[PDB]
Symmetry: C5
Subunit: 111 residues, 5 copies
């Protein structure tokens, strides 16, 4: 829900920045603004910590979706961030918008 | 129709069929433009990125769609023995990465078309 | 204003006039200080051209470090809940060429929300 | 180097609107400067079985160095640091190589 | 050797067409020469000075930089300059009595514009 979300995030958004799309991942929230991808996660030994990882779109230097199998396929998203050897890795679970998120990442990363 | 491909212009890949199939993961502002076959795999050139589509595993049932934005291709290289027996190799270096993406270009692959096409999009 | 907005701003406030007078020998003639945040152990100085991150370093804390970070060098950044009681925050700034982030403590009571907004403003924009 | 001949021989991998401008031939390396990139062609050494064709757009050349090398510092060594790398591309410019020319040409293309 | 004219005589053949020498600083082991297009580090080594390197750093390749004060009297203030495409920073002692503040201002003028 973009409304509860804009209300929560607004104090750390730029003045002209706007929330445009959001996707619920397994443990993550993928928040697409006009300027950056914000990954909102639950960290810690339990789940008390919260992280907001701001990724400007020009920092997404390559990305990949890999599926395994024919029926009931596994799908995994990899997003490589400039300067990082390891990619961010996200399961595209039996519950995630597999195609939408790829189209959105493409839309923002390619411009 | 490989001979049809040779004999002038005709892409060896069915570009129309490929566009229909990839449509759900392409941007509304994005067009499929050219594609080359590397054995069972594909080098797909859109108006915005190179998409490497590789079938992996014994069955070829594990498929990766690896997208490289043209603006992120920093430099590139083909190492080749021409028509001596050996295969060629492509290296693509990507912005803010350290190691290149490495792809074998098996003998018979249109390595010259791939190179010229990369130059077209990576310079632009 | 919110009940604590005024105080949080004063808590990490620095006199820019005094700071400009002292930093001016190393600033470009076309450079102005715009904002500054005095956090727990670091002074974040936002100029029109770079973040100058100032802190004490050395084996016995006798050195002073002036780290100039042009805004174009900030590749990505993260803020996370920090501290045993989960009151504070930890900022990670990834600078171009460095695979490890600069890690900085931000304490509740200071302008933690403000500094995140400022980083977003300059790095994005 | 006959530039007209080289331009025709490289034409299959050049853009239609790309001009070959200058070329420098070393022992195992051929530095080709086009309007759009340096194509560094390395035909390798005595155990070589392939040729490397390395296209380096000028904007990827982030800094560079020439240093004296060899016995009595009569040869030179070129280092080209390229965007995204940790370590440079290293090439030997033996005495008799156009060391000053190559340096000036890189300055003209890589500065901006 | 910080005479800009002598540095021009030495560097002329490798300079671009409308490139001018503007400032030069003597460091402990090299020279930082600021041209209108690049920082050129000149290191002439040995007793005979035969081993020479010219390291050209376009100003856009200066990613970030840091100056740390000495702290104690047996140490120098230190400059680190991180350059694109090179993992390790360039590290240079800023010796007492030299233009320690000036070189920082110069780096900021050229790198930041």
């Amino acid at each position: 829900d973009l409304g509860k979300l804009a209300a929560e995030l607004s104090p750390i958004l730029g003045d002209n920045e706007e929330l445009q799309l959001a996707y619920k991942m397994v443990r993550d929230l993928f928040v697409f603004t006009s300027k950056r991808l914000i990954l909102i996660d639950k960290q810690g030994v339990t789940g008390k910590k919260v992280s907001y990882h701001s990724i400007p779109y020009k920092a997404i230097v390559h990305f990949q979706v890999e599926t395994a199998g024919t029926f009931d396929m596994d799908a995994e998203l990899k997003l490589w961030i400039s300067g990082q050897h390891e990619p961010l890795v996200k399961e595209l679970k039996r519950g995630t918008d597999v195609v939408g998120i790829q189209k959105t990442i493409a839309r923002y990363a390619l411009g």
